[model samples]
Target: PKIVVVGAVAGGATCASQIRRLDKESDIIIFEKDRDMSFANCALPYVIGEVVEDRRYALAYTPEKFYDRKQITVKTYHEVIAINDERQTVSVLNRKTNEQFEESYDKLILSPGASANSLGFESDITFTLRNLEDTDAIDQFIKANQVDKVLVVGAGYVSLEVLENLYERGLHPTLIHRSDKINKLMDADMNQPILDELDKREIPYRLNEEINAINGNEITFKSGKVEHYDMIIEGVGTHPNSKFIESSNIKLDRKGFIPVNDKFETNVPNIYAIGDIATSHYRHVDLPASVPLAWGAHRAASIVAEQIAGNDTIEFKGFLGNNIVKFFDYTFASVGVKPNELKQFDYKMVEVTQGAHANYYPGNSPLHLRVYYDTSNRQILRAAAVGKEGADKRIDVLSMAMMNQLTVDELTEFEVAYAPPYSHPKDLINMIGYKA
Candidate 1:
């Protein structure tokens, strides 16, 4: 069996490595459009924040290791610009050499990174964090220029992280979001403490402000307002890297995400689409966020391997958007479908705060938990938690529970090992379950 995979970041790296382990004799070639492959995309922020020591630490695997041990061929600075489904061939370009060629494949995998999303407003001035080059460019600009006041556009998890990191670098930045609220990952009411934390830190922000134009170093808002800054940061969002594929007539949603069925296969056989480039069936989000988007490609790779090995493959579970963020002194985590994004799906949100440990415990902290469930059986559809301690574990537990179709009752009745130093006899998670 032979397979060719495109884009070697998280999803593509996961698929190639896993497939190699599954079948030692099978031929596999990974095409990376960038210089470095299998680098830590999520840790790019940490590098900017100085939480990580260097960019070299961001890399995940070496091409030498993959070649010597697994006999996997990796081609960097090579981009697959087009694919022909009927002929089962792809046109590739050696980006460094400016050469183009065609190669035939028995099976193909499309798992490209969803880089920076922009409109006609896109400019090279504002920095983005879609890749290592972006991370380096942003840091270099901050060092090379005297960037005192900064402006951050868009309000998502990474945008907020950049804001905090800018603060770490001793620069106060202004945030302008076109959305009514910040952090689309959480229900609006659940985001209050977050907004409150930002306020307490005296972070400047404006809601419902859209960029009208970029006049030199100044940004004009649709409200006829203007702000001047030494530099700007853009975190609008990401769409699939399928602009090149669209010309090939591959089916993509209007917004550009490929929709695949349970088999991870498109309408055409022997060609599969996976990762953030693909649609998420869990909820209707304008951009399906498979937190750590690599997992999508990782799971699908096994099925692809099985299919090539002549074994029955497993179906992919719809994407369940999951993420955990630590801002200020608290860590917040969420799972399952988002209620704010889904109106047709009836969901009621429940909020409660319980002690991370027994109230009498010396180091105890408050655990804030929110749950969205079906109004009838109260089956958990989604959950969010924000607190100093034990928030990630509780959110994780609820995520798995919901996946199993467990009700709120099951979450409460579920037993957990506990102690005063770790958790209360009635865990904070259990309290949310009980209150639900």
Candidate 2:
């Protein structure tokens, strides 16, 4: 079988690599529209602050490595314009030279990642970050220009991260969002800590406001207010990049995301779609962009390889979405539902704030933990945390517990390691379980 993968980021590259690993005899090739292939886009925020030291640190695998090391062909700057389902062929355009070609495939993997939302506006003072190229462009602009005041639109993770980076680096940042409340991320009460943190820094922000238009450095708000800045960023959200598949036989949902089964198998045989381009089934809902997390792509690709190998494969049961970030002195981590979302799932909720470690010893920070669970079956619906030291571990453990269908009581029984430098004998997990 000849496997052809489109979009060489997280899902496409991983699927192509795994197919080669599982079936050594099968031919594999990857087509990437971007110049850089297999790079870490999550590091874009760091690249702006120079914390990553160099841009090269973000490239996970080079095109040369894909070809010379594994004999897999890498066609960079090649865009799949159309998919011919009947002929198992793809019409492609070489983006660099503007040439056309066709490639036949026995199996195809589509992983066109989500497109960053624009303010329906563009200008010299406007920018949006989604790739390494964008990072480089923004970094260059900041160094080349005297940008003392910055305006960031939207309260999404990317927007917040960039806002913090600029603010911490001594640039006065003003955050503006469309909603009345800064959407309480994954955790219910987690937003206030971040809100408090930003307030302590006295960062200015506007609620129930959105970008009306950008006239040079002047940004007009939908609320009929205007502000001026040296630069402006819009990160409202994203739309699935499935416009190319409009001509294909595969069906997309109402939201334009490719529909797939748990195995990532599409309606068309020999074709699979994964990553941000495809929606996953989770908690009885067709989550349009559920697992856009970087790790989710690799998991989908692994299953894709298993399906191609004609062996026992793992089912993508559902997404236990986990997100973590560092802002100021706190690390916010979340796994599932916020408090407001608990009622829809018939879950009872509990909130607890306890010391992260043995406070008697020293340096023990407080972790605010919230859990949602079914009172009938005692199953955990979700969990979230916001703390400086141990937020990651708690969220990860809770995510694993939810994936395994572990009850809230089960968390108390785990014999977690403990010491003065680390955790308490009655660990935070145990404390949450006890409170639940």
Candidate 3:
């Protein structure tokens, strides 16, 4: 079988290699519009901060390695312009030479990912970080221009990381968000501590202010306020980078993400969509969502590959949408549903504050945990934790509990690993469960 994968990043790269592992005879070819086929995108901030001084450390795999190890053909700077479902062929364009060609495929897997939304403004100092190229550009700009006053737009993970890395480099980064909250997935109340952390570090920010225009190094906000900065880094929102599907028969959701069934197969047979471009689902909800994290992409790749390999695979039910990030001295982590966003269910939220470890232990910090459960069934719907330590641990356990459809009582009964230095006798997770 000739299997062709589009956009060889997290999902595409994983899918192609998994296909090779499952079926050695199946020919696998991956077309990547950018240069690097795979890299650790989450660690890109370290590169900018010079903590990861070497660029080679961030790269996951090169095209040469893919071919040498698994016989997968990876074409960099090759873009799939269109997908012809009727003929089972994809229109490809050699971006380097303006050459166009068609490649026939028995199965086509799309992992186009997503594109950073436009800032509606651009200048020499304006930048956005999405790939290694962007990182290099920003890093060089900061060093060459001696950038000190940095203005970061938006309040997502990218913005927060950029702010931290820039601060580490002894640069002052002022954050600005169009919304009142840091992240839509996290409730504003839960994000208050993060904002407080920002204030303690003298990192100033303005909420509910939109950038109206940018001229030179000056920014004018919709609130009729003006500010100047040496550099501007925007990590706004993203749109599905699945434009190649526009002319095809496959359907797109209202938000531009491709909808896939339990098999990860699209409306068009033998064609699958994964990664940020695909619509994801929640654990117990019927709603279609999107998981733009690395783990989700890798999981979808494995699921799609197994299905194509003709193995009896478990039907894709959904995910908890778990996400974690380190900011300054605090670790903010969340999983499952954000009760504030959806009103479809009868959700009850419970909050508890407990020690990460034994109260008498050294360096014990307060871990704030919140759990959202369905009132009717007492099933854990979502959970979030914020603290200097053990936030990731609780979020992971809660995510697993939600995945297993565990009720609040069931969660309280589970025995979590405990040590004086590691966790309390009644862990914060157990506390939240007991509270709920």
RMSD of each: 2.8, 2.1, 1.4
Worst ten in a row by lDDT for model 3: 336-345
Candidate 1 TM-score to native: 0.92
Number of the predicted model whose lDDT against the real structure is largest: 3
TM-score of 3: 0.97
At residue 243, candidate 1 shows an lDDT of 78
Give one digit per residue, the lDDT tens place, for model 3 in 1-436: 8999999989999989888888989889999998888887888988887778887888988999989999999999999999999999999999999999999999999999988887766578888889987888898898899899999999998888888898898899998999787866775687887788888899898998788988998888988989989999888988888778889999988778898887888999989999988886786666766778899898889988888885746568887789988888888889886646457778888888878888889998898888888888888777888889889988888887888888887777879788789987777777776776
TM per prediction: 0.92, 0.94, 0.97
Instruction: Identify the superior model by TM-score, candidate 1 or candidate 3.
Output: 3
**Residue-level lDDT tens digits of model 2 in 1-436:** 8999999989988888888877788888899988888888888887776767766798888789888777788888899999999999999999988999999999999998988888777689778888888888887888788788888888877888888888866789898888845645655346776687779999988878888777887878888988788988778888988888989999988888887888898999999998888777554222433667787888899988898875656777877677777777888788765445566666777777877877786777888888878887888877878887888888888887787788888878967888877777877788777887
- In candidate 2, which residue ranges exceed 4 Å CA deviation? 181-184, 283-289, 337-341
- The list of candidate 1 runs beyond 4 A from truth reads 119-124, 283-292, 309-311
TM-score preference between candidates 1 and 2, better one: 2
> How much lDDT does each candidate structure score?
0.77, 0.81, 0.86
In model 3, what are the clashing residue pairs, if there are any? none
